[PDB]
Amino acid sequence: ENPYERGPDPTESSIEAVRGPFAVAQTTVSRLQADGFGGGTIYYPTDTSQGTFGAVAISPGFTAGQESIAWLGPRIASQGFVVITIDTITRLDQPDSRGRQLQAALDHLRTNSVVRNRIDPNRMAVMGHSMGGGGALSAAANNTSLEAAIPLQGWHTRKNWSSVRTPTLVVGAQLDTIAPVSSHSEAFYNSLPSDLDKAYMELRGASHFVSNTPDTTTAKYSIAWLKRFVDNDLRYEQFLCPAPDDFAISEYRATCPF
Numbered sequence: 469e470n471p472y473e474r475g476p477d478p479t480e481s482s483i484e485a486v487r488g489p490f491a492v493a494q495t496t497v498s499r500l501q502a503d504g505f506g507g508g509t510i511y512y513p514t515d516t517s518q519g520t521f522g523a524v525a526i527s528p529g530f531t532a533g534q535e536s537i538a539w540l541g542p543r544i545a546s547q548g549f550v551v552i553t554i555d556t557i558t559r560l561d562q563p564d565s566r567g568r569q570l571q572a573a574l575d576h577l578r579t580n581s582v583v584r585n586r587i588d589p590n591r592m593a594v595m596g597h598s599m600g601g602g603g604a605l606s607a608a609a610n611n612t613s614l615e616a617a618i619p620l621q622g623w624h625t626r627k628n629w630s631s632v633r634t635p636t637l638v639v640g641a642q643l644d645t646i647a648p649v650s651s652h653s654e655a656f657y658n659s660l661p662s663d664l665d666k667a668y669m670e671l672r673g674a675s676h677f678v679s680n681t682p683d684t685t686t687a688k689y690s691i692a693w694l695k696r697f698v699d700n701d702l703r704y705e706q707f708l709c710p711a712p713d714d715f716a717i718s719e720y721r722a723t724c725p726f
Contacts, residue, residue, distance in 0.1 A: 504572025566603025
């Protein structure tokens with residue numbers, strides 16, 4: 469019925485796995501080959517038997533490089549997605565610039581010889597850490613066609629996200645002192661439209677850089693969100709609705725039923 473369903477029926481263990489059911493290969497986009505971004509690594513499933521996959525672009529934070537968000541690339545791609553982890557044109561790029569670069573990286577995939585036949589170009593999503601998370605929100609605010617947006621410990625001077633029409637999962641860190649949830653993550657979630665499918669997850673005891681190394685909670689809910697909204701996969705709503713009970717989650721909000 470849903471032609472975008474990929475992989476077997478999920479379980480808590482399947483979405484917590486460091487690698488999902490799809491073997492992953494990678495290709496490098498050099499800074500010189502990248503127009504509108506500073507290059508990146510594309511992770512993709514080698515199995516094309518189940519059809520095309522949605523695309524996800526991930527941005528690092530201020531002064532940071534792809535190495536800070538690299539682990540998310542094949543962890544998410546192994547669940548059935550084409551994922552590009554990007555470097556910014558400059559390490560000093562601000563959130564709105566990072567959002568433009570996330571969109572440029574998604575559009576690069578449309579003509580990339582290695583992945584153009586593997587992607588469904590109509591199904592794309594944006595994610596990012598800190599300023600890169602503010603970039604993911606900005607990209608969604610500037611593109612109503614995006615299917616999912618996931619800011620991780622997002623940082624932005626803009627707190628009003630009334631123009632976002634893309635399902636958004638806001639991930640905050642409880643003890644964040646760089647992008648405090650009260651002035652950043654929660655403020656962003658609170659300004660999303662009231663009819664938007666959205667969720668807020670606060671990571672218990674987590675600091676700002678929780679997204680820079682493997683975090684099972686971040687991975688499991690990012691995977692469930694991308695499946696539910698890039699693939700319209702109703703098989704993954706069970707992990708978001710009703711509210712989960714992970715002890716690693718200190719606060720949770722969701723507009724269930726999605």
